[PDB]
Structure 1
Amino acid sequence: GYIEKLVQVNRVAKTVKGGRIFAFTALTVVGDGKGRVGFGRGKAREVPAAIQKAMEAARRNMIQVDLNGTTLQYPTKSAHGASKVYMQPASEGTGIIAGGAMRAVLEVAGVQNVLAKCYGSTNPVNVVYATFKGLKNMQAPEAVAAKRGKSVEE
């Protein structure tokens, strides 16, 4: 898909005999607004080159999510590193109640009512890791219902 969003641009440095060498890191998310989504990281010596590399990396390794009509299936709670993430479905009139990496990830993924919240560190890359770990494990019915028939598991 093609929906580009830029999350964070940071400037890092390494020390050499002579002084400091600077570089730029960029984090981006891509998706089609209907279930495909992925993130990418890039590094370069200029901001546009890093952004381009991040877009190219993010356009690969895109995954498919299972969403129940512009909203999640069930309340979920994921984590990565020291970051914890909580999301839960909301009514249609609700917006996206989230901040930073949450908002970009969920808006690009195609959901509109997510009402999320994060605990622990708010490092954007770890937050994105945690959010995709949570979203990639959305089961949806007819798959958790592989044990037996349908309309009895619910």
Structure 2
Amino acid sequence: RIDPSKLELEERLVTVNRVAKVVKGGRRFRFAALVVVGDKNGHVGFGTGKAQEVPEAIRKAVEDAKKNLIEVPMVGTTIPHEIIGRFGAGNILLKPASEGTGVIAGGPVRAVLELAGVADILSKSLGSNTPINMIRATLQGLSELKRAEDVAKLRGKSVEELLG
């Protein structure tokens, strides 16, 4: 599945990284920028773009993020349950919280979750501090999340006894 572009999406440039290549004529520099893009209703996804000029590199990155998007469950403006993101030594814990706490996460993680629009959530970063790997791990977790209704239908049961 792919989510089309019939939406209003904001972009939050998390980081631009200086990048260099070594050649006979000294050094060759470029600019690699990753950005997380997505509406607040619940659609998210990152992108990347490398080029020699920062603004149009960001343009590349936002186009990539638009091309690659993901949905997330949003039970009560908060995740339904526990989850650990497990991408390449990027360990991120997420926990649902009461309806007044707010967003509690690291920089890149906070950008991703706030862009998703989750109002009340807490987290923790246990793996490497690398931003892109943070993003990949947390989005793997967010994908791994499961709504309650599909769980009920999978079990052949109903929400009332699943919550009971």
Structure 1 unaligned regions, length at least 5: none
The answer for the alignment partner of 1:21 in structure 2 is: 28
TM, length-normalised to structure 2: 0.90
Of 35, 40, 52, which residue of structure 1 is paired with 2:47? 40
1:128 Cα deviation (Å)? 0.3
Q: Which whole-Å CA distance do the structure 2 matches of 1:142 and 1:99 have between them?
A: 30
SS at match of 1:152: helix
Q: Which whole-Å CA distance do the structure 2 matches of 1:99 and 1:64 have between them?
A: 21
Runs of 4+ displaced beyond 6 Å = none
1:100 Cα deviation (Å)? 1.2
1:153 partner letter: L
More helix by share: 2
Q: Which whole-Å CA distance do the structure 2 matches of 1:149 and 1:69 have between them?
A: 21
Task: Report the identity percentage.
Answer: 51
SS at match of 1:106: helix
1:112-131 alignment, distance < 5 Å: 112-131=119-138
1:67 Cα deviation (Å)? 1.2
Aligned length: 154
The answer for the alignment partner of 2:58 in structure 1 is: 51
2:98 partner letter: S
Structure 2 unaligned regions, length at least 5: 1-7
Over residues 1-37 of structure 1, what are the superposed CA-to-partner deviations in whole Å (9 max), with x where a residue is unaligned?
4111111111010110110000101010111101111
1:7 matched to 2:14? The reply is yes
User: Aligned-pair RMSD on alpha carbons?
Assistant: 1.0
Q: Which whole-Å CA distance do the structure 2 matches of 1:66 and 1:23 have between them?
A: 37
1:96 matched to 2:103? The reply is yes
TM, length-normalised to structure 1: 0.96
2:74 partner letter: L
CA contact (8 A) 1:5 1:104 kept: yes
